[PDB]
Design a protein around this nucleic acid. Structure first.
Ligand code: SFG
Ligand code: SFG
Lengths: 246, 246
DNA sequence: TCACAGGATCCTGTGA
DNA sequence: TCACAGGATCCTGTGA
């Protein structure tokens, strides 16, 4: 139940409790997928979408690389737990070539495996005093053994077109919380998502949305109310982890 | 790829993408140079010109000062993040003596490191609740290790005599935008620059001009059209950052 | 004088 | 108890 890469917000753990609610579908849509904690572990076909083209091209790529391919690039850069400059180079190189395979290595050495990218589309995460380890290849493998049941998409959720008959799984940025990618989020976003989430219901299209109603101080009222029109399955400084669905 | 001093409009970041277009030259001309983000980082010889003699004399000066020289003047004024009056003094002193080294310290405590000067030639930037920090000396050093490949000029661009064989790099005030130094700018200026920029072309002299075609709602049509006669390499509330060149 | 890009890490679940 | 993998923030410098 591993994700292809370590990823902030990943769901490895909750998938179990999360599948217990999944309806049937002709296509599984992972609207916001990042880590692929879900996609790599649901029943095909899977439309894995995420707005971050870098991470999505990185997947498209990975499909044909091999663990050796990977190991090679590392040896070639002589990267390791304390290789700060070797890192900074690999960064520059990515930034220039925009070669997906390189992003995949970097993510292994970033500060807390963060994959942060800027306006200009550059990888800017600071060194993280780390490199690959056991799970590295396990993650690597697991990806390669399951990605063939996936189709990758890199569109704003509001553009993925949902067909009638597929199941949509939403796990977007949590308003109240703050991971890096919340830079792509706002209330105006929480809104369109929630309104369109409605649309999908009227079209008799089943959906599943994981999020937090309260975390660390503030609360998501907009959804706290919206959440009524549909179900709920509370899961939780205490943050209330829920699964709002139909 | 640091500039000698923090500076509004600086190009630290775009230099990379900007060098990828630089032609060959016997002399690099930095027509409008302020921050020295470019000059300090191109291949000598470099004719760094800027109209603001204060900032230019400040450089001519700096050539012989030492980080200690610098630190000294600070200690001597007991300046720091909250030293508002100590600041105001250092200001007066500059205003009176017109001693370049002092301007260099001030710039470190100005509101947003602005180096604003008036008709009477006085430093008038308000206190900025700040003083030196890490980058201060880095900036300081980088200047001192590269300035020897530079010749400083403080003339209106329309006078900086261009020789046949050098490359001219233009990055003047952006019409549509408004930094302090746009006080030296106008359409009549955009014009002379553009017309003379033509002249340089006819003389078979290569030139490079960074600017914005559109920012914050308005647009620079005069150049939007003029920009056709030559190349373009779009880089970008969205502002369109471009590099018009031959 | 705040909005923003960008260098930074301990606290924690978990196999041993 | 113990080592290791893994992350829904942090602070500081900076200003078209
Ligand atoms: N407008 C948007 N459209 C699509 N994806 C977005 C948007 N804003 C943010 N995201 C992505 O939404 C994701 C949120 C994550 N918590 C998804 C986690 C994922 N299901 C996992 O378990 O690995 C990230 O991968 C973000 O890059
Ligand atoms: N007529 C003029 N002649 C020469 N310089 C001028 C004139 N009007 C304005 N300037 C200067 O042109 C500059 C525009 C700046 N954006 C140059 C930035 C510089 N390339 C840097 O990145 O540090 C300022 O330093 C202004 O002081």
């Amino acid at each position: 139940m591993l994700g292809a890469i370590a990823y902030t917000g990943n769901k490895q753990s909750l998938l179990p409790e999360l599948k217990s609610h999944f309806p049937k579908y002709n296509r599984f849509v992972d609207l916001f997928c990042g880590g692929l904690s879900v996609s790599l572990n649901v029943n095909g076909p899977v439309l894995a979408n995420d707005i971050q083209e870098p991470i999505i091209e990185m997947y498209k790529r990975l499909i044909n690389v091999s663990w050796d391919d990977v190991l090679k690039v590392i040896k070639q850069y002589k990267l390791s737990k304390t290789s700060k400059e070797e890192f900074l180079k690999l960064r520059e190189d990515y930034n220039k070539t925009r070669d997906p395979l390189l992003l995949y290595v970097l993510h292994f050495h970033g500060f807390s495996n963060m994959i942060r990218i800027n306006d200009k589309g550059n990888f800017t995460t600071p060194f993280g005093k780390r490199t690959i380890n056991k799970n590295s290849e396990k993650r690597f493998n697991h990806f390669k053994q399951n990605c063939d049941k996936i189709i990758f998409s890199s569109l704003h959720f509001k553009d993925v077109k949902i067909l009638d008959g597929d199941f949509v799984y939403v796990d977007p940025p949590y308003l109240i919380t703050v991971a890096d990618y919340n830079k792509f989020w706002s209330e105006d976003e929480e809104k369109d998502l929630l309104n369109l989430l409605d649309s999908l219901n009227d079209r008799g299209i089943k959906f599943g949305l994981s999020n937090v109603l309260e975390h660390h101080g503030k609360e998501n009222t907009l959804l706290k109310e919206w959440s009524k029109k549909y179900n709920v399955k509370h899961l939780n400084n205490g943050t209330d982890e829920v699964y709002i669905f139909n």
